[PDB]
Design a protein around this ligand. Structure first.
Ligand SMILES: [Cl-]
Ligand SMILES: [Cl-]
Length: 180
């Protein structure tokens, strides 16, 4: 399923996985525009540290309130909120400590359910949850490969990982070159 790894802009890398453009870059995820932005939170959906702090501060208090209230109503594997003041239609809040392949599979299925074309996510689980970056990179790309292999890619055209630490971007780049 894998295409050639190229660089469309300085420090940005991309490759095809089936019909999907998979892109990685380092920077501030809150500057991104996408149908869905993913937040890597805790099992309380109340984490406000590192990337989750940037996301909740920029998304605003209506997104914070909706997370806390949804988390009270039942036990959630993940929560879908509106985008608040982020440049997106929905935020999907995934638990950083959870299986990252499972989390990305859920995000892809929820995006197809809404006929969404673009997803932006962080290096899920590499912050608060302290999952190893190479395991997280393997898990994210494996989830997209499985999705594509099942013929599930319809509306989803672009998956972009915007990574806080350039040193973690380097791990994603190496994982992409392994598959090329
Ligand atoms: Cl995390
Ligand atoms: Cl990150």
């Amino acid at each position: 399923f894998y295409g050639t790894v190229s660089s469309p802009d300085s420090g940005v890398y991309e490759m095809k996985i089936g019909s999907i453009i998979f892109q990685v870059a380092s920077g501030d995820i809150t500057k991104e525009e996408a149908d869905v932005i993913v937040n890597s939170t805790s099992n309380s959906f109340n984490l406000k540290a590192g990337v989750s702090k940037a996301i909740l501060e920029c998304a605003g208090q209506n997104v914070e309130r909706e997370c806390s209230q949804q988390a009270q109503q039942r036990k959630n594997d993940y929560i879908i909120t509106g985008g608040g003041f982020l440049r997106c239609k929905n935020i999907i809040h995934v638990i950083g400590g959870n299986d990252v392949k499972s989390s990305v599979s859920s995000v892809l299925q929820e995006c197809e359910k809404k006929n969404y074309s673009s997803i932006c996510l962080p290096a899920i689980g590499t912050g608060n949850a302290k999952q190893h970056p190479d395991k997280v990179a393997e898990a994210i790309i494996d989830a997209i490969e499985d999705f594509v292999q099942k013929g599930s890619a319809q509306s989803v055209k672009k998956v972009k990982v915007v990574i806080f630490l350039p040193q973690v971007l380097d791990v994603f780049y190496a994982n992409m070159k392994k598959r090329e």
